[PDB]
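Researcher: I'd like a structural prediction for the single chain below. Treat it as a standalone chain; there are no partners to consider.
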Amino acid sequence: QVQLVESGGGLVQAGGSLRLSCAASGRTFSSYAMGWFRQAPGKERECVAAMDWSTSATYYADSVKGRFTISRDNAKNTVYLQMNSLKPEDTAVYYCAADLDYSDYGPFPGDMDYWGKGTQVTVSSHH
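Model: Treating it as a single chain, here is the predicted structure.
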């Protein structure tokens, strides 16, 4: 069975970093575009980042440009999201997703071929 499993999330202080990891298993993924979505309760799910397979094109939501970096490792069947300078507005469930069609990311996404179950990221501040 095909699975995308996110890890590396959880709690982090504002200004901190996390590196999400998506372990993709059960089929060949090197010809899939991979991406990250996020959704906070009461808000729509949005595409945060994506990367093509057939070219090195990447997409980032405006709110994360310069802060988040998507990359992948085909040998490890993993996709990463380096998330820096985190703010409370980054708090959400982050989902890994795979799609044959890179044009299905980003600001008006299509449906993905596979979805991870998601992992919680919580960015808190303290004053």
